Symmetry: C2
């Protein structure tokens, strides 16, 4: 993969692992649009699902991508160094398409700056709290010891310190949840959930609207 | 149109004029995702072009929309909570499609709160400046006198005040540019331009990528 530190963006293969990306950004002061949590599908799958644990609008963090349609056609979308007169949003079309349009072979993601970072966890209480400052990522996970509210944030040491003081809990190390979703990260009443979905091992993919089913046949 | 003040969103027919939306919201403390400038096509046209004068990601400000395809079908997309399981972004697909996918019959836009606003202009220097704080909208327009840099911002009274301080210039009133673009707001070497396009009366529409031409045939 390619880390464009100065321009704050990353170029990586769809098959790149989420922790693989975090490992590569170690000490760079740059952060990807996802927490230190490994999930089935890697970067490509994450993009296809429209992100994980975000408290922000994820699609805008995807600057470009190249995907392979279920028919074998290569489609390039967006870009950084080269781009057409814009419009015709092929990037957002793919983001959140859950694999219906094929798999991402390459993804270009925006990276955000941060002098400090904190990945914390604390006992869950039913609903997601409104923290201040709002962490960039928030999600719940049941560890069999009860639910756990996880939060990941980065930015100025002052905002992060502020985050720690508002959240409390304990420091958490990078998680690898692939072992708990062997049949795939689908949707359902599973042990993991964020502001958008509740995930379940082998759960079904969300139902696409008629229009999407139609366009997917000709892409 | 229907103003859902408490939920901070607006439902408007595609033909609603940009200035009628502003008049409808004047005094509500809520602002639409466009400045006080009338442009050919109304809100539907604005959405089709992917926004006007924004310094932010415009597509995210569009929560839903209903369009009639060239073949006659009508497809309802998005809809803040309750549409489908957040995925398959038909909304962003339409935003910035320039009419290629059909006409917007209805648009659902997010409204942003603000206790103060400022619409100002100053002689354009030849390139867009990096302002601090950065205004929500910025564009350049030529008049008999010459090119003018226009900026529109809203939000916290102290934020807007600081903007007025850094930007300088003079107070500007709502503009109606339909008379200057009677043949439509297309692309070209015209008298109006923002961070994404340079507009021209009766100008051409941007060229769609192959993938877009393909799915346009269906849906």
């Amino acid at each position: 993969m390619e880390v464009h530190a100065a321009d704050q963006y990353l170029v990586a293969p769809g098959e790149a692992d989420l922790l693989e990306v975090h490992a590569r950004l170690a000490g760079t002061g740059l952060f990807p649009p996802f927490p230190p949590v490994e999930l089935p599908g890697g970067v490509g799958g994450l993009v296809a699902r429209g992100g994980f644990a975000q408290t922000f609008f994820f699609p805008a963090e995807v600057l470009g991508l190249t995907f392979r349609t279920p028919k074998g056609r290569r489609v390039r979308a967006g870009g950084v160094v080269v781009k057409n007169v814009q419009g015709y949003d092929l990037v957002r079309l793919f983001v959140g398409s859950f694999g219906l349009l094929g798999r991402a072979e390459e993804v270009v993601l925006r990276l955000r700056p941060g002098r400090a970072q904190a990945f914390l966890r604390r006992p869950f209480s039913g609903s997601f709290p409104r923290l201040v400052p709002t962490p960039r990522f928030l999600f719940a996970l049941e560890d069999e010891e009860g639910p756990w509210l996880y939060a990941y944030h980065f930015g100025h040491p002052k905002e992060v310190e502020r985050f720690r003081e508002a959240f409390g809990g304990e420091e958490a190390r990078p998680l690898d949840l692939r072992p708990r979703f062997p049949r795939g990260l689908g949707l359902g009443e599973g042990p993991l959930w964020d502001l958008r979905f509740r995930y379940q091992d082998g759960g079904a993919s969300p139902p696409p609207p008629p229009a999407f089913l139609r366009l997917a046949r000709v892409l």
